[model samples]
Target: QQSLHIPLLKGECWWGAAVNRAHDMPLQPGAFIQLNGDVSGNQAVPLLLSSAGRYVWSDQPFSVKREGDILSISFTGTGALYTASGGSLKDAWGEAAARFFPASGRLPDTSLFTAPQYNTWIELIYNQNQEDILRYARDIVANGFPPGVLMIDDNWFPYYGNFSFRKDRFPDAAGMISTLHGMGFKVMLWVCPFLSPDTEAFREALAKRIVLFDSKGSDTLQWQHAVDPAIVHWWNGYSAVLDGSNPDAVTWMREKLDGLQQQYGIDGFKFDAGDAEFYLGNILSREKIGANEQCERWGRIGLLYPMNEYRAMWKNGGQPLVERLRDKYHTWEDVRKLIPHASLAGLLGYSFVCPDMIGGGDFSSFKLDQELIVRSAQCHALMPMMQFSVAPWRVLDSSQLQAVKNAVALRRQMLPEIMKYTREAAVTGMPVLRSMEFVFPHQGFERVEDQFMLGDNYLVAPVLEKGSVRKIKLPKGRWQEIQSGKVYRGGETIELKVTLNTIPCFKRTT
Candidate 1:
C-alpha cells in the first residue's frame, strides 16, 4: 500500500467534473479533477472510479494536493477503491469507466430515449394549451422534421402540485395526448415537487404533513419566484416544496402521475430543478437531513418513471437517468460550453447525457435570430440526444429551416451506430457521446474540447463559433469527412471549410 502521488508536469492541468460551461480548469482546491496531466497539447491520466455524489456534482469525490512535483490524491467513499495508472489518459478513463455500469445493470430502451424530440418550453412557456401543443406536433411534421418524442413543458397542469392539466387550457387532456400519439409521437410532461399555495392539492398535501415544515411546525418551507414574488420560485412561479424523504408523499405523487397516464395517454416526465439551493433552511426530519441528501431524495422520485430527465443530480451515478445540462443563453459562448459540459457528464459516469435545449430554452427576450438558432441546432445534431423547444420553421427562413432539417436527418442517420455504443454504455458505463480523449487516449485527444466522438468510429467536429471554417484534429489513423467524402490521414490537424449547411462529421476508415 502506497500513498498515491501522481507527478505533475509543466503546463499540465486537471480535466473532468460533473459540469463546466467553459474550458477545463487549472487545478484548485475543492475542484474535482478526473484526469491529471500536462496541457502541452499531449499527456493524460484519466482518474476512474471517481464515483459521483454531492450537490456540486464531483464525479470522483476526491481531494488533490501538489507538493513539489508529487501530487497526492485521496478519495472519499466506502468499498474497494479501484485504480488504473500509467496509460494514455483516454485508455485509463475508458478502463475505469467500463467498470461502472447502470444501476439497473442495463440501458433503457433507446426507441424513445435516443429519438429526436420536441419540447414546448421555448414556444409556449407557461402559456401552453392543448391547441398550441397539437399545432406544434402538426407543424413539426408539416415542416419536414420527423416527430418522435414531444415534451409539454411547465404550466400545463392546473397548479404546481396538481398533476392534471388545466381544464380551460386543455379541455380534452386525454384527447390531446391521443391526438399526439396518433401523429407517431410519444408525449412527456414537465413536473416539479412544488404545490401552489391556496390550491386543493396544497391543502391536501399540507394536511398529510408531507410538505416540509418550519421548526415551529407552523410555516412550511417556501420559495418566492424571482419574476413574480407572490408565489414560489420554481420556473413557473412559487409553491410549497414536497419532502421526498417521506415515502407517503412520494407514493401519493406516483399515484397522481399514474392517474395522468391512465386518464390521459401520458408517456413520461421531464423532472426539472431539484437543486440543493431550494431545500436549504428547510425541515423534513428531526434526524437532520442536509440539502444535498434531500436533493438526492428529490431526484430519486423520478426513478418511478423509466423515461426521465434531470438538471440537478447528486451522487446517483450508474443510474438509468437522462442528465441534461442547465439552460444556457443564445450567445456563442454558451453554445461553445455545450461540448465541455456534456464531456463532464460522461466523466461523471452519466452515460446518457443530453445537452440543453437547442438554441436555448428561455424566450423572455423573445428575439428570434436565424443564425443563432441554426448554429444551435447543428451543435445538438451529433449529441446522444437532440431536443427542440422552438420550432425551426417558425423562427428560421426556408433555407435555415432546411439546414435544421438536414442536421436532424444527419442525427437520425447516426442512430444505428449511436444505439450500438449506447448499448455498450449500458454494460460498460462508458458514454455514448465521448470526448476525443476518451477514444484516442494520449495522442493529444485530451486537448480538443470543441470536438467529440460518436463511440470510436465517427469523429464529430461541430462548428461552435459563428463562422464558416473550423480547425479539426484527427486521431492517428485514416479518416473520411462524411460530408465532402475527402479522405485525410489521422495524426494531422486540418481546417474544414464549412458553411451553414455543413455539420463537419467524419468516419474513421482506417
Candidate 2:
C-alpha cells in the first residue's frame, strides 16, 4: 500500500470523487470516500481539486480521508499517487486536465443543449410500447412544449444484448421514430452492456469469445474451462457482461449499436448500468483489467456516438457525453443533492450535466408532490441540460404544469449563454456550470454549494426550499435580477421575496 498525509491549510478543502457527493463533500475532517470498483452513477473521476490551488491524481482507484485538519490518501495499486498546487481551484483543474484527460474539442448533438429532453423511464418503466410512446410525444407538443431528445428507456427489447424493438409493443419502431422526427423530436433508445442468460445472444457472445469469463489470468491457478461465462448480478438480473477490455468485444458492441442506427432511424442511445460494482466479481479480461478500467471499456461505446447520455463513467470527462444523476427519490434531500453533486462533477472535469430527471428518477416514489415537482423543475431550468421523465400535464394541474413549462422556456431563453459555455467546455475542459469557489477563490465561497454560476456571468439561485423567501450572494459588480429588473451592488448578500413561479437569477453588468 502507498499512502501519505498532508496537514490542512487555514481553510483548505477538496472536491473529488473519493469524497462521494452522496456521502458528504469538500474533504472535511473525518470526511472519507473509498473509490474502487463502484460509483454512485454520476460522472465519477479519480481526481481531487482543492480551493488552495492544489490537486491530487492517481491513474488507478484510491481512497481519501481527512482526520482533524489532516488529509490522507491511500491506494493499493503500484500506480503513483499524484499531488500538486498551482494558484486556485480553476488553475488546478486546468493544469490537471491538460496533463491528464484534456478536452476532445467536440460537443454532443446540438439539440441536447438547445432544448429539453424527455425520458420514458419514470413514466413507463419497463412497459414501453409504440402507442404509449407516441402518446407521450403528442402530449409534449399539445402541452405547448418544444420537442427535443426523447429517450425510450429499458425493456424495449426482450433481451439485454438483443438490439431491436419489441415486436408486440413496438410493431413498427421505424415508423414510430419517423413520426417523432416528423413532429420535431429526435429519438434514442435505452441500452446497457449486459447479455441475458439462456439466450442466443449470450450463447453467441460466449461462442465468439466476446463475453467475460471468470479466471485468474494466471498459470498457477489456471483459469479452467468453465461451463459458461461469468454471471454478474445487476439491477435487472444476473447476466453475462460484454468485456470492454477485449478489443473484439469493444468492436462487437460498437457494431450492435451502429447496426441499430442503420436499421432503425434511431438518433442515439442512453447508455446505462455500466457501474464498477457490477465488475467486482471474479472476472477476467483480455487485457490485465480491474473493475474500474473495465467500466471505462464499456464507456467507449458512448464516444462513437455524438448524441449519447451516461450516468456512470470513469475518467470520461471533456468528451461529447451528456451525464445525468442516478435514480433519486422525490424527497427534498434528493433534490438538494443535485447542486453539490454537479458542482463536484465540474471540478472533476465532467461538464454538460443534467441535474437528474425532473421530480425524481425513483419510479416507486412517483406519488406526485406538486410543490416538489415545480421546485425541481426550477432547479433544472438553467442547467446545461434539463430532462423530463414524468408527464407534467398528466398529473400537474394547469397552473403547476404551466410553471414547469416556464422553467423549460427559461432554459430556451438562455440557450445562447448556455451553449457558449458548453462549447467552451469542449475546447478548454472548463465547466458549463461552475462552483463559486472555482471562479472567485479565497472568498469563503467554498462551502456555498446551493447555488451556481450559469456560465461566467449569470448567478442562478433557484429556490431550494419551499419557503417564499430566498437569499442570494452577488460578487462585486452591478447585478440585475432577471425577472424583477431590480439592480443591486455586488459583494453583498440579499434576501428577496420569491413567489412559487420565480427562480432568482441575476446577470452581472459591465
For each candidate, what is the lDDT? 0.68, 0.82
lDDT of 2 by residue, 132-172 (tens): 99999998999899999999999999888899897999899
Q: What is the TM-score of each candidate against the true structure?
A: 0.85, 0.96
CA RMSD of all predictions: 6.6, 1.9
Please provide, for model 1 over 386-406, each residue's C-alpha lDDT reduced to its tens digit, 9 standing for 90 to 100: 888877887789899889989
Runs of candidate 2 with Cα error greater than 4 angstroms are 18-23, 78-86, 216-227
TM-score: model 1 vs. ground truth? 0.85
User: Where does candidate 1 have its weakest 10-residue lDDT segment?
Assistant: 36-45
Alpha carbon lDDT at 258, candidate 2: 88
For model 2 the local lDDT of residue 32 reads 76
